[PDB]
């Protein structure tokens, strides 16, 4: 398994990274008046 | 007017609609009573306590 996983992870990593490369992110506002930001990094 | 208010806010809208909990259509209602939050008062008195949301 582990040896097959290497090849399979590689091609999935490549595939998944390219998919995301031309994704298009749409603005979502609350009733509040609030844009929702897609970021995974509270860099405070 | 707490009884008036319970009637106009909650009970009246139940009339002639199906209600999932009694498992039928509610035709109407009798003998509304508020349970005093003061457990020490008599079921009699017309002065009662109602806890306010924080």
């Amino acid at each position: 398994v582990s040896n097959k996983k290497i090849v399979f992870d590689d091609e999935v990593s490549i595939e998944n990274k390219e998919s995301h490369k031309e994704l298009d992110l749409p603005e979502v506002k609350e009733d509040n008046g609030s844009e929702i930001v897609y970021e995974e990094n509270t860099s405070e | 007017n707490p009884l008036q208010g319970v009637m106009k806010q909650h009970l009246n809208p139940l009339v002639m609609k199906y209600n999932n909990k009694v498992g039928g259509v509610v035709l109407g209602y009798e003998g509304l009573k508020i349970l005093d939050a003061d457990p020490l008062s008599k079921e009699d008195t017309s002065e009662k306590l109602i806890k306010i949301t924080p």
């Binding site: 609350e30 509040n32 008046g33 609030s34 844009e35 929702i36 930001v37 897609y38 970021e39 995974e40 509270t42 860099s43 405070e44 | 199906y18 999932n20 498992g23 924080p54």
Partner: protein
């Protein structure tokens, strides 16, 4: 006399509302993008020291990530509820995926009332799971509960009135 250069990004900022962060639904960090101002641990302690519980509630809940959310009174979860998807003409209701049976399995064990069946978007029918309400929680609680369930951990909120 010498005039000293500014060394500092002085510029003021104000936020009423504005962009929030995806995970916590709390004000983003920003200025140049309408970020919120932080009330951190020290200011928390100060607010407790005053005895001002509403000021604390205003800052760390109401004006931050306050959220009315559904709970199942029965299993005590805030993650397993959803809106039902109704037939046209009917009204949507709020249901718990944990506490309800797949329709088939429920038949396979008396008559089953109409108000007790609900459906999702895919089309599967369910029986039960109608003991829901709404509670006011900080949004970040949902995130924490979500992360915990990834780790196999379950939070169970006891709600009143039963």
């Amino acid at each position: 006399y010498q005039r000293l250069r500014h060394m500092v990004n002085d510029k003021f900022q104000v936020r009423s509302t504005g962009p929030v962060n995806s995970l916590t639904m709390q004000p983003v960090k920003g200025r140049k993008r309408h970020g919120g101002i932080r009330v951190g641990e020290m200011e928390r302690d100060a607010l407790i020291g005053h005895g001002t519980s509403f000021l604390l509630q205003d800052r760390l809940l109401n004006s931050s990530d306050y959220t009315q959310a559904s709970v199942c009174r029965e299993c005590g979860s805030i993650l397993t509820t959803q809106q039902s998807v109704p037939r046209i003409g009917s009204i949507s209701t709020v249901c718990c995926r944990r506490c309800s049976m797949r329709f088939e399995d429920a038949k396979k064990l008396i008559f089953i009332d109409d108000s007790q069946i609900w459906e999702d978007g895919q089309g599967n029918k369910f029986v039960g799971g109608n003991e829901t309400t709404t509670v006011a929680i900080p949004f970040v609680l949902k995130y924490l509960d979500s992360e915990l369930s990834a780790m196999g951990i379950r939070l169970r909120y006891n709600v009143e009135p039963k």
